[PDB]
Design a protein around this nucleic acid. Sequence first.
DNA 1: TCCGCGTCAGACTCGTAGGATTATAGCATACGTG
DNA 2: ACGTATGCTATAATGTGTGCAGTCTGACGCGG
Lengths: 277, 251, 50, 1340, 50
Amino acid sequence: RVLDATQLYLGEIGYSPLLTAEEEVYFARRALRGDVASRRRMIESNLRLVVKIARRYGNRGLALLDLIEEGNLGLIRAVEKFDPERGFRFSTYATWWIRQTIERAIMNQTRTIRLPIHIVKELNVYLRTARELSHKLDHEPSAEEIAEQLDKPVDDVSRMLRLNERITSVDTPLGGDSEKALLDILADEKENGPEDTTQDDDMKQSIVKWLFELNAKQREVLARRFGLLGYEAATLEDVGREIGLTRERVRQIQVEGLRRLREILQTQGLNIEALFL
Amino acid sequence: VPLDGGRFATSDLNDLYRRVINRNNRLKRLLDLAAPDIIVRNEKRMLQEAVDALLDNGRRGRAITGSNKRPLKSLADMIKGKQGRFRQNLLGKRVDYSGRSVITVGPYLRLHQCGLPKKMALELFKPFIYGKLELRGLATTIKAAKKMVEREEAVVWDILDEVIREHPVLLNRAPTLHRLGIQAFEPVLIEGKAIQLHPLVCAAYNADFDGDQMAVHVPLTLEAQLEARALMMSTNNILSPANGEPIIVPS
Amino acid sequence: GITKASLATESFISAASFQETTRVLTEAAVAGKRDELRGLKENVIVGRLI
Amino acid sequence: YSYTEKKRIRKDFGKRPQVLDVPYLLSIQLDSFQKFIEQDPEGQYGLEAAFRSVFPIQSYSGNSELQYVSYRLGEPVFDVQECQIRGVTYSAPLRVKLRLVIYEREAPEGTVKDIKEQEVYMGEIPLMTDNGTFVINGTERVIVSQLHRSPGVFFDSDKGKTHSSGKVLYNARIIPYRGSWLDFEFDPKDNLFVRIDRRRKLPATIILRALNYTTEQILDLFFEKVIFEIRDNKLQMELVPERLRGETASFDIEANGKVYVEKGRRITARHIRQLEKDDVKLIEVPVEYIAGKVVAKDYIDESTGELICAANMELSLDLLAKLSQSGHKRIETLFTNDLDHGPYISETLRVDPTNDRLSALVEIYRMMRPGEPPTREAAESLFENLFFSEDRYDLSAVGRMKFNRSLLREEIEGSGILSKDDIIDVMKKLIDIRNGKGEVDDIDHLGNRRIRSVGEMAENQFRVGLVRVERAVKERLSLGDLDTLMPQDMINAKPISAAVKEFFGSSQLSQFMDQNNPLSEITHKRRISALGPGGLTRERAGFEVRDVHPTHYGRVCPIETPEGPNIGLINSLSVYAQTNEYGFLETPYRKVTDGVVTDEIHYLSAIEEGNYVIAQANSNLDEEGHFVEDLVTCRSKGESSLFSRDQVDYMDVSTQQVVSVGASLIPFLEHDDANRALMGANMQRQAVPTLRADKPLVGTGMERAVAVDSGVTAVAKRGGVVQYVDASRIVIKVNEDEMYPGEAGIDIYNLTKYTRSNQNTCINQMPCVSLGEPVERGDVLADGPSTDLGELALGQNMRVAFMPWNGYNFEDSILVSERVVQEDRFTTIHIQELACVSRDTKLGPEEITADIPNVGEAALSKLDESGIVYIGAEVTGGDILVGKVTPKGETQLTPEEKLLRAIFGEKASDVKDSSLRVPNGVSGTVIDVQVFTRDGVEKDKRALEIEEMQLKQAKKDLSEELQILEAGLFSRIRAVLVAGGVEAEKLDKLPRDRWLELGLTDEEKQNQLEQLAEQYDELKHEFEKKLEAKRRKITQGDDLAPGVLKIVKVYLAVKRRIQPGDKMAGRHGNKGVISKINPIEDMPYDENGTPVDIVLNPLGVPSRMNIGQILETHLGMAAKGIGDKINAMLKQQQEVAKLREFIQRAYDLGADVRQKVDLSTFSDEEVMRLAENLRKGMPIATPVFDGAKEAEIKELLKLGDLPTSGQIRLYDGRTGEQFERPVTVGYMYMLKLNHLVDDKMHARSTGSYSLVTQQPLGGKAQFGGQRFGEMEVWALEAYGAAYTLQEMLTVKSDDVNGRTKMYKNIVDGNHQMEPGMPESFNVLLKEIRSLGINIELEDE
Amino acid sequence: IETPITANFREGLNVLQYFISTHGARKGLADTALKTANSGYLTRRLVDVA
DNA sequence: TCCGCGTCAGACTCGTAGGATTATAGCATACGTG
DNA sequence: ACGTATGCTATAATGTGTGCAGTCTGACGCGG
Ligand SMILES: [Mg+2]
Ligand SMILES: [Mg+2]
């Protein structure tokens, strides 16, 4: 029989009313006043018109079946708000809706990174300006050449072109040879290897031994300022909250803790050795 | 995740997910409007097409093709066959403390020996240098030991030379047919980017010095050092398991 | 047969790791089978002692 | 002979004089793309075809239409030089003239209403170089010619679809260039079916009904007729004697007077001639015989008017009696036969569930569009659209040609659409083959495998651009206003530009040129593939395709193809092979006229090769006459045997036409196994050119041909004296005869100096000519990177000795002297090219200054203020080439870092570091740096210093152009002026700016002075705009990617030498790794003392069966023996006469040497420049199969006072005592393959980690650990080593806890197992849960 | 092939003798690449059951 | 139960290389938070 | 006020299709 979701729906619209001028008015007049059956019919009837429109709005974002569904939503909003008393036809009024609803729904579900309408709307005028220029310049227009014709900013044009830059999927094969995708190459940013994990662990355990090698009033004041032992990373003036309650003596004692610690790094074998780092 | 070039890159699942959510939310919208059933039918058929395409794309009908006219990789696909998680990212693994290089002959070596380049074994035994360095007291910390190695200073070669002694290394050749496709030896540091392999065990690997490469692997744990010396040492592996016959034989 | 004897073992992990992975899992899901691990493939996967 | 040839002559052991000289090897690529751009006036080809095909396009209403006028190519925006550097396509503007014509609607066709006409751009097409390359985004790329199944018709049969029946089911298939497929196929019951697009299977009479054919007509077309006359009472039947042939007499067969055969008897050929000579026409027969026979036409009762019996219905006794009394005593049955004329359409109609024409178009429509209710027009439109519309369908010229000659037709050229005739004719030959006559075609025959070069493919992709524009034109025309809308508003230039760049990038055929060797370039452009789109696949590829087919002879090389899964599909073109005008291949052949082997050559197609018998080139000609021998070994019909003289029709031209370019360079190929010959020709392409180009002592002759045609060298366009020699360029003065009378006549050749390759190797052009040397037209002026006096120089020859050496040549392992390493002869150069990118991040723009945070004065020593390394600065891994800094954002300074930045200080600025530094391990010399900037942000000071040079160097370079062009232009006027007003010094008193002031008498030469005067001014005005183009493109802000602000490209030059691990080989596939560079003390040496260069293993020879290497060695030694004698006489400083006698005695030795070079013709000076190049060794040519034999080699060895054997008395260097017995020593031309160990060795302890798998990455490229696959795993399972495996599953791979924890434990010394559970499994859990399956870890 | 190779490597093949040598050479090396998968796949099949 | 035609499961193992799309109108009040 | 979203345009227009069609041996599962 038929097992294609496409052909099945396209069958069911092929057996649905094809309305005349005064027929549209008869149903529409009752549809606004809520006849229930009337709103269903005008819709059922003009599903065939939605398909002919989505026949030129394909290959841009979604599939043909996805354009029809969102194109049907335009016909419905057209039925929610049509004027039968006006002598002008419905097929004319409904086309303006079905063309809009499709374009709009493609603008959202086409790009992975959801680009709002505003940044997109503008981008199109920059691209459609590139058309005019390209045909007469016979040269694909630059960021400047587009900026000179609109008389608009250089960075605006450029930043809007940056958002047009499309994607390569992580699972994409590499050089017409699906030996490895980008995941089997692209490195993990977050976790650095043991070498970098143990760097901090060893360096910060060495400091725990250096803070116990200094004075009690020097390792108290120095640690709680940087937020090493304390809970919050305070400043020279803020160390006064604890017990210091000083501005001059906190600054002399902070630096006194650091001067004795700089000699602890010169004797262990770092200082200039760990300066490059 | 974003590329270095200001581009982004997304898995095909995210794209397949957006197909499911869009159609599902559009169905919520049409059930709000009490739309005619003929449309609701299409929406339900679509929703199922998207769900079935998310679980296993290429199965029920045409697999939903994407940007580069290729089919979107679905969920089932990452559990399916060679290219799945099992065979590719679980039973088989790229491994640390591993290096590979062109092999060449080692006609001076004994059976339990193999040439290992210095700059290879250098990088391979990196945590063993940092360890023996803190013991002698030459490194106070590890970033200090890191720079000592980087500068390739003279006394660091002698420490590297110390750890490697009485330490076996695994030598693998592709393809790994039988167990003898890996044998362990005692590395001999040699100045040069070529590995030097023992002629008699060339038979086990089927290793021809015509441009062959062999993977190196360092056994980390003391148990791995014992395993490598006990089971996987070249001297303890003579006869083939297939036939009670010596595979270690001049040619 | 070999191809069938591999898919027959009570271990479904050993079976899916082999082939027919789409079918193995579905049959194992409906049965609600629990693998207690005996084979090597099973413990090499989880990264345990062989 | 020529001058450049006089400098060094190659001794040729050929004995088959070349009647056909080797053609330009880059014929295909250049000629193909030439057709694509070629604006043919009528015979549409390439673009002209694409427009006439699609255009004219008219609106959907048909009131307005767009018409193609003419197109043109503008000169390139950026030339090759610039394009290669900037990084954008080397393309030309496409300006096409369109014409918008609109009709009147109610009026008939008011064609003259508004004929708008204007010119419009759409897309820029990548042009092809003179090398046959396309520069895409600054990469010279090559598009390989494709090999695909030829359109037309083709008959096949699955020799056993159902081995159940085991019946050979025959099938036919019409393959178009564009359109739907049309297949006809039988079935177990021999019912003819038709499957359009191989879709549903439909009865084969349904398509005929669709072509308006009644049941009667159908039968009348295929089957013959059997006449039955019912005369009075006796039933009678017409008999053609040749019908009851090989059948049994079921009844008593008797005639006017004689019983021939008895009941139940076989009718033999005797009985058939018995009846045929008796002239039998009518025979009386029983009524039981018709029971079974099928009635042909319809039979209505004359009386009633009803069908007594319809057409195609099995007759019976009662139906026949009903027909006899109806009033029909002249019934005509069909001629059903189970041996010959088979009844298929008959049994097929009984299955066929259709009725008339209109109903046949229904099931055809219900097949392809199932579910849509059919109308009269929808069903008719579909079927008419399939194979019967000028739009959908196109067989093409080749399609119709092959289609016609497959049906043995009348026409070569006909219609692009299938006619009714064509379809039935195809069904007819399918049924012919089924009967017995007719043979199926095979696909492996090159008569069915057509070649499709780039130009045809560029045409195809250019059509899709036009097809995608067709959509936007029609829709905008109909609904859009007629007047207002202009034609360019409806055209879009992107769909064409995009569809063409899709081809020049993404296609499998468009790939980066492999140019690591002149041979690689030339053999990769002569590559032909069956893969990519519209071809085959490794997954789909069979065997019989790959197999060498006897059609390949002379067309395709039997020994040229990768040994990888893409083995039999990829193939190089043969030497003298060329494309048929239609598409097939063709090979040269010497015509034999009335026995006489005429010099007239005919390129025979793959089809006509099978027809004539073709003698081999081994056959001997009688010096203008015929074959010396009566019997000649020849070949035809795809077989080989001996034939007589008059029977020979054609002959192989040369003995090298069987092989390719790759194989024509292998000497003594005749003494080499095809398996090792293939590998040898494959590795010869991988031969990285050396530092000093060394000529091959043991060549074939093809050497020069390759080097010259590759387009890597610079050959003279016009002969004359080299006015100026230089390392950068060459200036040559043209002779009077060749020089044009209009221009000055001084050619300019700016030689390509050291710069990068696609494989990161050196490219240089050194002058091979001396200052002020007389050069002939078409002579090599500058040599390439792998060429020497115009001859190809891939690797280097050296004294080799075959013998074992303490196992340092174990399995083909190589033992090379330090003396080779001392001469730095095997020292390849790698020109690496780094790049530094200034990007625009979210935080802010990056720049390029010397100000870099956390740095030593030592790093910024080689940089300038701008932040770029000086030209000529040596660099090493860690040193920074170009200083870059990016913005640093909200950065959480960790307490331990805020304290450390507060102690030692250096509060690093809010700008991150990412300076381009030399990669760890590389070290060389910066030779140049190029800076690209967007048109915007102000520049670095170094970027200004580089602009200074480009400008002031271009100002000088153009000053030099107009200067020497002036001198050559007045040089002419000076000679013109003497003719007429003869006055020498008095004319040369005042300066040369007042020479156009002086003239001559009313004469041709007065018009000449006016030409040169106004052409001098033409160059004087041209010089300004030439300066403008240079100046602007230097000031121009090069357009960059979005986000990028400016880039700095650095050019390095590392000098890597040979070392253990380096892979080298001969050209006989003899591979090997260098194991040890032996000390000069230890190297073996002859009694005389000179040591050996390489010591090879003799066991890499019997097993290999590549004895060509040993012959290469022997001849190389003989050749060197002669050079050693010439070297000695030139050192001794003897005489011109003494060298002349010896060298004349050398050139003339071979049996019938092809070249007969007399030295009495050579002048004394010409002899000594020759001898000086002969002293390194007399270069010898050994044609592929017409090479030298032992008789010739051993005779040459006696001239060199070398041993007849080729084995020398060798002494061990280590010791000094002799080896127990002689060893083969000689000079073998070996090669340095690209597989160098510095680009191979790798090591890793801990580094990057994968993104999801959380296991390490792959390759030294990304610094990744070696893969331990499941096969590698089972090995440890077998050993029993359990931790060694668990260690390689967890801590070495995923286990995030384990890897870091284990690291810390190793530095502690405690090598302790600390597992947890790999991440990649934790992924697999959630992945199965995401699939709606409860997978939890059930505990103890 | 009905007609084998008459020549050897010393004497040198004529033009066809080499063309004939090709037929056997390419098919022998075609079964080195393609047929190996059947034997390597057998190793895989055997292992899983054992 | 049996025989033809459909889907579905495999197809060796490791190494190296490199980069590009079309277009969603056009303009005016509604909805969400400093 | 700024960013995002929501809305309407009133000639008539009302059933789609686009695109690769030499894998192969072996094994069942739904109809017929
Ligand atoms: Mg090898
Ligand atoms: Mg080998």
